[PDB]
Amino acid sequence: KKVVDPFSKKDWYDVKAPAMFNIRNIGKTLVTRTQGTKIASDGLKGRVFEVSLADLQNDEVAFRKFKLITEDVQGKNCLTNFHGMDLTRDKMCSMVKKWQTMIEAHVDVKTTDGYLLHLFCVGFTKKCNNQIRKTSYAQHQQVRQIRKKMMEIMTREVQTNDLKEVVNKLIPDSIGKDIEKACQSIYPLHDVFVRKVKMLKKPKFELGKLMELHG
Amino acid sequence: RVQPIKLARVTKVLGRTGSQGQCTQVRVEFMDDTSRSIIRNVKGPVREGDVLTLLESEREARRL
Amino acid sequence: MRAKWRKKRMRRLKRKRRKMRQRSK
């Protein structure tokens, strides 16, 4: 559009996060003022909001970015809902290096509620305690165990435990740390992260369940 | 541009560049900030400790 | 490339002789 003063016809807003975050003031957006051919809220819902982890928790690392969608608008405050987490590029790149064997697996999983998720994890072999060898490569048999046991843990903790409790385990990354010790006997391993989660399906709006998060 | 006329002075000369040695790399101190320093290309014969008259410090040198 | 071309010009020429002899009978 090319309407005269098209940033003095826009209306400022605020964007509020769930109660689980210490700092809930995400930031600000703007949409155009209401017309009868297209209203404010219809051009404001269905967005994505990339936000860092450090930005909200204010205690910890600047990676593990979360996506948040505006599902509801309430009087100049846009309330958000979980949509899936992702990871930075540089961290994901730096860990990958020569003379290691990268280990990967995924699962499709359902929550106790109607949410459906598709988690992606990663493991890397350890450059061991006092090698004089310049390799850290592992057998193929050993790897397929580690992948099997990385699925077993990540289904147990996410099939039970409702949507919010999932998030609570991933913020300190209790999930990943649990796998690191449980695989330690068959190869020591340093590093476990969940590089993506993609919320595939989700249930109905459910206003009662909605406001619990922003309580 | 719309920046006023700046003045900055040499701290050290680095070496000559260009394709006939006609340009000279030089390090210069901003003469208002003593921890700020930019590298420049300067045409004329320079010694050290003399002052220039920069029209901008947006520009910066990297090669011949 | 040179040898591969000398083998190619003589291939098409050989093919033409076949056609020309098949034409003659």
């Binding site: 003095s8 826009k10 860092s52 590029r89 | 947006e58 | -």
Partner: protein
């Protein structure tokens, strides 16, 4: 131009979407969401020569204007997202990546964060140029 009703001790954070490589530089300042946006300036608009569109000063002169209209509105800080072309191409920044930052920061705008974003395949379709590739 009307900004929000407080920005006194806080900042308002936009996303800068700097584009990189050759024959072109974009700077395109947007919302946090990126759904809606503000002014968008190219190095082909500052400089017309069809060959200085990727130059340092053309990228600097661009951001030297864009950063004014930011603060005019009320956007004071910037998260940064990069983009090199990628997609089985050069996948490496142009000249005008380093350039625009140095200019826009010292114009007065705040910098909040910076990151690399590039579209990198996990192996995808064949690249233009043929088996023997470009020569001359």
């Amino acid at each position: 131009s009307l900004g929000p009703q407080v920005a006194e001790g806080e900042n308002v954070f936009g996303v800068c979407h700097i584009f990189a490589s050759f024959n072109d530089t974009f700077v395109h300042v947007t919302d946090l969401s990126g759904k809606e946006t503000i002014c968008r300036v190219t190095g082909g608009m500052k400089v017309k020569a069809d060959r200085d569109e990727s130059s340092p000063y053309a990228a600097m002169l661009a951001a030297q204007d864009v950063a004014q209209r930011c603060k005019e509105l009320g956007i004071t800080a910037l998260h940064i997202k990069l983009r090199a072309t990628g997609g089985n191409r050069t996948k490496t920044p142009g000249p005008g990546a380093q350039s625009a930052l140095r200019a826009l920061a010292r114009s007065g705008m705040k910098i909040g964060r910076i990151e690399d974003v590039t579209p990198i395949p996990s192996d995808s379709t064949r690249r233009k140029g043929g088996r023997r590739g470009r020569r001359l």
